[PDB]
Amino acid sequence: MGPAFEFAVAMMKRNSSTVKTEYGEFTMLGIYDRWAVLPRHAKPGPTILMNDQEVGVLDAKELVDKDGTNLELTLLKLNRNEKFRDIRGFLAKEEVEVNEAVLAINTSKFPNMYIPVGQVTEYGFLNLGGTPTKRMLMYNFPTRAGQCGGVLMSTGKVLGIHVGGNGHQGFSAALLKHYFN
Amino acid sequence: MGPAFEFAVAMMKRNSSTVKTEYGEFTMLGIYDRWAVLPRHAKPGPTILMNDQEVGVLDAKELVDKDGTNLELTLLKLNRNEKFRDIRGFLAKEEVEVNEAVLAINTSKFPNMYIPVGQVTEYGFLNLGGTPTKRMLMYNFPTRAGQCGGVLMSTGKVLGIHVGGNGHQGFSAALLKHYFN
Ligand SMILES: *[C@@H](CC(=O)OCC)[C@H](C[C@@H]1CCNC1=O)NC(=O)[C@H](Cc1ccccc1)NC(=O)[C@H](CCC(=O)OC(C)(C)C)NC(=O)OCc1ccccc1
Numbered sequence: 001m002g003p004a005f006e007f008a009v010a011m012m013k014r015n016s017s018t019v020k021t022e023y024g025e026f027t028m029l030g031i032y033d034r035w036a037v038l039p040r041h042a043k044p045g046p047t048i049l050m051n052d053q054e055v056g057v058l059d060a061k062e063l064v065d066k067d068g069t070n071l072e073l074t075l076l077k078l079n080r081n082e083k084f085r086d087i088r089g090f091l092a093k094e095e096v097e098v099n100e101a102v103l104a105i106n107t108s109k110f111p112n113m114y115i116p117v118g119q120v121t122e123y124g125f126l127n128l129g130g131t132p133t134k135r136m137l138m139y140n141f142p143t144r145a146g147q148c149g150g151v152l153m154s155t156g157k158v159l160g161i162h163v164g165g166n167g168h169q170g171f172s173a174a175l176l177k178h179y180f181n
Numbered sequence: 182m183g184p185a186f187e188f189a190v191a192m193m194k195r196n197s198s199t200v201k202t203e204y205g206e207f208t209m210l211g212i213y214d215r216w217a218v219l220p221r222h223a224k225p226g227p228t229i230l231m232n233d234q235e236v237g238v239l240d241a242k243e244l245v246d247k248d249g250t251n252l253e254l255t256l257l258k259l260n261r262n263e264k265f266r267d268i269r270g271f272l273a274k275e276e277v278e279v280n281e282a283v284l285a286i287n288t289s290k291f292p293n294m295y296i297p298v299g300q301v302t303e304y305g306f307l308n309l310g311g312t313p314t315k316r317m318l319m320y321n322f323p324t325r326a327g328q329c330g331g332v333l334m335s336t337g338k339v340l341g342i343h344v345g346g347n348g349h350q351g352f353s354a355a356l357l358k359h360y361f362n
């Protein structure tokens with residue numbers, strides 16, 4: 001648990017930001033170059049608020065699998081000269097299962113807060129927000145509004161992004177290496 | 182930072198609880214025997230709600246120094262057969278200063294959340310909530326309502342209990358070994 005927290009803190013410091021869209025406030029994880037990720041329901045427009053700053057969105061892909069089914073992730077290209085530290089090496093080729101994970105949030109609401117969520121299990125199918133959704137990772141923690149975009153990690157691994165909950169369990173969309181080339 | 186988180190998680194698991202009083206919801210740290218601590222402003226009555234459960238308060242000391250000055254801590258004797266694990270060994274004889282601390286919260290609002298608050302400095306005097314108050318530990322973190330009772334820790338050390346903030350800094354009352362005999 002210790003090293004997983006240490007890893008999470010350094011990842012949030014280097015690669016994470018607080019984002020506001022017309023749809024609420026989110027944690028945002030920068031991945032490589034100028035590409036970052038939000039939950040698809042953040043519904044980012046032409047311009048987002050990133051650490052209170054008007055940033056232009058050059059391009060935005062809502063992710064779907066081979067059937068055209070929703071993965072609940074939007075990739076965003078940001079109009080800024082700073083490049084993110086490339087964290088593709090920390091992203092698995094397939095859904096990861098883990099016994100201890102930490103969920104990391106960085107919003108006005110939950111500023112630099114870290115949650116030990118316990119066991120993460122692959123949960124693949126889930127009817128999320130009414131929508132059938134694949135590649136969900138599940139943890140038994142009472143997750144709330146304001147936590148979306150939260151980054152789920154274990155030692156040296158970025159597992160997924162928090163996208164929903166049913167009041168008793170939370171679910172991350174798996175953040176897979178092939179989404180980023 | 183890793184071992185401090187590991188220490189904090191195990192301390193909250195063993196010794197902490199969520200308490201509701203007429204004055205709000207708090208994190209509560211059990212110390213030894215049947216004695217626990219809240220911020221004095223929790224203003225615990227004859228009966229508190231402890232993890233949703235009606236618990237009787239046998240005795241309650243609001244703490245003050247030698248001048249009769251407020252320390253912003255209430256010690257509570259609880260009417261329950263379970264004794265807390267004795268954590269007096271983790272309590273310093275005087276105010277502790279540290280470069281990395283973790284603040285741990287356990288409420289409905291902030292369930293099992295851990296915050297790396299950075300440097301803790303002894304701050305002794307502060308006019309808190311209008312009231313002159315001594316033995317304050319300071320950290321530069323945007324602490325909010327709902328975080329009172331939060332437990333401030335470093336590796337193998339319980340430093341104090343979170344009792345206030347001014348929107349930019351937070352302050353813990355130092356939890357000193359001599360308060361508990
Ligand atoms: C993040 C929002 C955020 O950060 O706020 C910005 C300020 C939310 C976290 C969730 C909500 C409750 N707990 C959480 O961890 N995420 C959501 O709100 C998403 C949003 C969304 C929108 C559109 C399409 C897809 C996703 N939705 C859910 O988590 C969803 C909402 C259901 C719900 O409780 O809210 C109401 C108000 C609409 C009723 N949860 C869900 O579908 O799971 C329930 C379920 C599970 C299994 C089978 C059937 C239903």
Ligand SMILES: *[C@@H](CC(=O)OCC)[C@H](C[C@@H]1CCNC1=O)NC(=O)[C@H](Cc1ccccc1)NC(=O)[C@H](CCC(=O)OC(C)(C)C)NC(=O)OCc1ccccc1
Nearest residue numbers: 205206222309310311324325326327328329344345346347
């Ligand atoms: C914990 C409350 C909680 O858990 O809610 C239960 C559901 C609060 C955390 C604080 C509040 C804001 N940020 C925090 O970290 N703590 C308090 O509210 C305490 C309460 C209290 C009451 C009576 C006597 C002593 C303490 N008070 C403060 O933190 C205090 C409040 C000032 C304030 O901003 O609130 C208003 C609404 C009353 C204006 N803060 C304070 O005095 O510091 C300001 C200051 C610093 C230095 C010099 C002069 C003023």
